[PDB]
Write a protein that binds this ligand. Structure first.
Ligand code: CL
Ligand code: K
Ligand code: NA
Lengths: 245, 40
């Protein structure tokens, strides 16, 4: 009655029989931009069900030695379905998200993933190792698309900050002996009411195995992790021709 | 009395502390009204 759940939005429904509640980031539900805060004068388009629905991205495989992955929003969907199309045809975009990360194993496996949302996830480089080289991450690393990317130094989140403190951000854990999914509802966060879905990623989703996967040999070894996300209250403005970047 | 022939600014100030608001509008399709056309 807290372990079972159903998420239905648009023409999509998710079920889970081993949940651990649902997190509402910073205690706020997503909402369309109100007239007091807005600044752009054109009437926006709010497609509703064609874009506020669940999209499932490519699946990753969890190994006894995985470092961890991350995805950027709204990058992941800029080229998927009607949402992506709207993001390309408009200068301005704004929305919230429902993030549902899935991973099930058996009562004989063990491990724990930390699933977190980090607003304005700016990445850094290892500075040529010595620290004398002012290198920067390439587009493919800052905006990995729907495939996401791999962390090279999870301990410092590839950004000089401690993973140990990431729990200060909206999160849940997928502890195999307890649950098989994490759900986080994220409201729009930015210093401006609307923004470009192409140039600015509002937040990043990190999935890091803090307690490594383990199991006796003979047990299923392919333990995937799947990410399903749904935009909420997607709004768009500043219509023109389509732009990919 | 015995000689009859011996007998302004249409704009003023307002206080505007803030820029004008934008009222929501919808589509208008018709003849007669044509706000986009001017005569400089
Ligand atoms: Cl590390
Ligand atoms: K005003
Ligand atoms: Na006119």
């Amino acid at each position: 009655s807290d372990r079972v759940a159903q998420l239905t939005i648009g023409n999509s429904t998710i079920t889970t029989q081993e949940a651990a509640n649902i997190v509402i980031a910073y205690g706020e539900w997503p909402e369309y931009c109100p007239d007091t805060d807005a600044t752009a004068v054109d009437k926006p388009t709010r497609p509703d069900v064609s874009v506020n629905r669940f999209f499932t991205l490519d699946t990753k495989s969890w190994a006894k030695d995985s470092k961890g992955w991350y995805w950027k929003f709204p990058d992941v969907l800029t080229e998927v379905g009607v949402f992506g199309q709207n993001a390309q045809f408009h200068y301005l975009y704004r929305s919230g998200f429902c993030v549902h990360v899935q991973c099930n194993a058996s009562k004989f496996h063990q491990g724990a993933l930390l699933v977190a949302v980090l607003p304005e996830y700016v990445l850094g480089t290892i500075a040529g190792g010595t620290g004398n080289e002012n290198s920067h991450p390439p587009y493919a690393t800052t905006q990995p698309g729907q495939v996401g990317a791999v962390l090279t130094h999870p301990y410092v989140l590839d950004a000089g900050i401690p993973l140990s403190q990431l729990t200060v951000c909206p999160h849940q854990w997928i502890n195999l002996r307890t649950n098989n999914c994490a759900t986080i509802i994220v409201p729009y966060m930015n210093t401006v009411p609307f923004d470009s879905a192409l140039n600015h990623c509002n937040f990043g989703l990190l999935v890091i195995p803090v307690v490594p996967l383990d199991f006796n040999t003979g047990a299923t070894s392919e333990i995937p992790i799947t990410v399903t996300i749904a935009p909420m209250c997607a709004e768009f403005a500043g219509l023109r021709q389509a732009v990919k970047q | 009395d015995p000689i009859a022939d011996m007998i302004r600014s249409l704009t003023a100030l307002q206080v505007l502390p803030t820029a004008a608001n934008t009222e929501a509008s919808s589509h208008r399709l018709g003849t007669g009204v044509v706000p986009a056309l001017q005569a400089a």
